[PDB]
């Protein structure tokens, strides 16, 4: 029809990348005859895949935005706010089109190890998909206006776009009027003004992926506009990255492993293993979450794939509702810590750090979290005197292990690939996806071509949202580093640079405070760009800083009044949010304790990666 | 699966806008552009490819169905299987030739900032792959309905193995060259022509039969020449005069609205409705006025037929007379400019289109006058009654109602004749005026209707584009083998007078027009007669007008004619009565044709004086 054209085309390109990578590994490992074009071809296709994902997201209106202030507004103000955000997004898309055309015209360098092919093939992705994004925005405007959620029809946008394109193509010297330098010369306060405007527009519902672009454009307009052409290439260059390839494949691996059949087998094995100790079903839940974390890079999937079973088992065992909710909500944070992890990949991409070292560093805190949660569950259960389930016979344990053998072999594969160094994170993700597909198709007989295509489509759709923010934050970093914001901030914060512990304490406190009202995914892209240079200023190790920031932000999904884990657990378990929060409250002590422990003693985190690499 | 329709319609409106900027800048701003024509051609190539793909998907390519209508279904199974296999081979070779030609072309375009010709030449394999996919999709339904013995999976595996062999072992193809076994020699072209006639009469579409015939001839002698010959396949569509066809078709479709046609009929009835035999005069005049805009006879037959038939029946006419008049009055369309057939002839023979239009204007008027005289005589002899004469108020109201409708033919004719606009520019202006009138003046136009009209125009132009490219490919072999010189050496005895050649050609065309449709017959006949006509020092404009008239004659001849069937369908009467009523009206057409072929000066004088 006329909406699935990006999903039909994007899905086909996703399959092509999978076939190319699997051929690269087979040739190197088996035949010892490596290929020189696989990486470049994969990155070239991934650029288009990411652009198509962005188009899908902007069509479905699914871009991340802060809704804390938006949730406390009568609709009569929401109408004006939505009108403003629609205008801002339209302007951003038009400027994307202009900059993509210009940077495609400017591409000159050839691509070696690809037959001398010019770089215009890479650089042409931006305008062709920006046109589709503009079409999708115009299409969505009709639905927005018809229901009374905005003030402007799509005819207004069509007329404005036609007029703007005609002006841009027939007299581009008319746009020099709207330069702030022509009226007021702020000087060195341009960065502060741009950041203030960025915060103001971000707090009123504008998505971050456009807010960063708007802030950077305002800064450039204030000082000088001719320096934007040099910096605009980073938008295309950010997607042309090898480490960024692992995100969609890890997402697809999690999606494929999150079927009902595999989860039931894993939970049955865990229950047969840890079901008869003091605090049985709590230990069962913790163990199941730990096992799932080795193959899943997200916490919401773990929360939504096992809650209805773990909560029921705990209720049958003799557990109160608050305890069930607390354990279920607390056990979710293990996922993002144990590798693989989307948050660690994002931090490594932003800070230009090796993902493997981040994974190795973050492996230990997951084990510490698991042990602390198990100890707390045992103490609570012993205090309350809950009954003990009968011991399982050896035959049932053996049968459950035989059933779940191939399902549980995956985390071992991931850890062996990563720790031993035989594979890179992207190759590890590719191997994991191939193994999961084989297991689903031939061993469990629970997969179909339609299901595989739908999983690929979902992975691309969730990848596009991250891709837009990645490219925009890469654009924002140039503005941040050009004017030396971090150096000035450090100079202002004098007499506190004596001890790095004070800086770490302040950063942790700020992150904890901000995590109570902003979702983790948005908070990461909101706070990292201005903190990474500041951390670099104080000679703070970047691997330890990344681990600490990831843990601190993952803590924030458990604290009221805004926490996704609390809402998900309450919805799944059919219980009120207040009871879930009350049950969660006693379980926040171990996480704070381990956070303080790693903050005081960085050697715990730093020892393992140094020994291994 | 509207993937081609959605993308093709987007390109169609892009072409329309670019052409508009060309004429406006050149007229009032006096700042002509240097890239509008190049962009128009470059986009028209893709538009034609998309139309061909759509036609392949819908299985609507033209073919001869005379012998196919006289055989049992058992034979039809084998015939359809053979046709499917031949089309599959044609599409595969199409893909291969597109890839080779794209990998060969390197020349730049100086009129577009040095852009390489690869941009033009890459449109062949990209759309060829989509055509192959559409054929595979249609094969499933063909096998499901029981019309063929070959399922789709067989085609899939055959395509896979063929692609693998081509990419990894092209040298294995050296066993299918006829030069391996026997060297036919000079008679290779004759053998290829015999195979072409047979494969056409079997039921293969023309646009593929010509390709098969020329490929067989090339493989008969040397396969290394087809590499040089394959550039014409893409260069054929890269033509600016060819752009007039889709826009004229769109203009006709837009103007064929029921509201406009009702007003035109009302004005014609108020004007010429009271004379003896008034209804026939009204029918002829309305057909002439609508042919001033349209360029197809089928629109004339199917649009205004019911109202004219009802008016004639009310007046007290007979069924045979009304049917005959309605059928015979539809041939004025292709004669009066604009006309699709004249454009096709000009493209094939490389002749000016404005000269063709000017030359062909007069015979349409002669036909109209002859038909009016014949109708008047028949009505007077049969003693039909007379209608009262309308008063000045009715005629003035009709004029005020249909002013904007009758403006368009005069605008088009004035643009063509005065030399102010080229035929493509005239088509663009006509389309713009029609859409403006529809949207704002009469208020019966919607954006969805415009998109549907554009889709229909693209679908109907793809079929013509495929035949155009294939016939241009065929002409290469025809010219290389020196067929016309051999034919002249054979019929040296016929060269006594050019009148003998003309009457022989006319008789052959008249005999061939009783079984084949006008379009298929034209595409079969023109490539073989144009070089022969040039051989005998025969003028090409006069020959084109005469051939167009002779081909248009065949649509009113039994046992095959589209006009008879359409008139019978829309008139609720048997085909036999329609034929027996048409028969007395064929005399003026034959008389006009004989008069034209006797005095070519009648056709020749007007364009030379007008130029
Ligand atoms: C709608 C909002 C305004 C959109 C303005 C379009 C961007 C400006 C532009 O295109 O630049 C012109 C000049 O722009 C300026 O002088 C600066 C305009 C400031 C833009 C500020 C954006 C708004 C930020 C807040 C929202 C032309 O210079 P050029 O060399 O890029 O010309 C086109 C090129 O040669 C074709 O290849
Ligand atoms: Na994980
Ligand atoms: Na006409």
Author numbering:
A (entry chain A): 3 to 615
B (entry chain B): 5 to 615
Study authors write:
Tripartite ATP-independent periplasmic (TRAP) transporters are secondary-active transporters that receive their substrates via a soluble-binding protein to move bioorganic acids across bacterial or archaeal cell membranes. SiaP delivers Neu5Ac to the SiaQM TRAP transporter, which uses a Na+ electrochemical gradient to drive transport. The SiaPQM system from H. influenzae has fused Q- and M-subunits and is one of the best characterised TRAP systems to date, with key functional and biophysical studies informing a putative transport mechanism driven by a Na+ gradient. We determined the homodimeric (2QM) structure of HiSiaQM using single-particle cryo-electron microscopy, the first structure of a fused TRAP transporter at near atomic resolution (2.99 Å, with local resolution extending to ~2.2 Å), which reveals new details of the transport mechanism.
Dimeric HiSiaQM exists either as a side-by-side parallel dimer where both monomers face the same way, or an antiparallel dimer where one monomer is rotated around the dimer interface 180° relative to the other. Dimerisation is mediated by the same interface in both of these structures but given that HiSiaP is found in the periplasm and SiaQM requires SiaP to function, the parallel dimer is almost certainly the physiologically relevant conformation. The maps are of high resolution (overall 2.99 Å for the antiparallel dimer and 3.36 Å for the parallel dimer, FSC = 0.143 criterion) with both extending to 2.2 Å at the core, allowing for accurate fitting of helices and (almost) all side chains. When refined using dimeric masks, the parallel dimer has slightly lower resolution at the dimer interface (scaffold region) compared to the antiparallel dimer. Local refinement of each monomer within the parallel dimer improved the resolution at the scaffold region, suggesting this is perhaps a relatively dynamic interface. The buried interface area is small (~200 Å2) for the antiparallel configuration, and even smaller (~100 Å2) for the parallel configuration. Further still, the parallel interface area is formed by a small number of residues at the N-termini, which have modest resolution. The predicted binding mode does allow two HiSiaP proteins to bind the parallel HiSiaQM dimer without significant steric clashes and each monomer has the same binding mode as the PpSiaPQM model. The parallel dimer is consistent with other elevator transporters, although the interface between the monomers is reduced. Even with a small interface, a dimeric HiSiaQM assembly may further stabilise the scaffold of the two monomeric units.
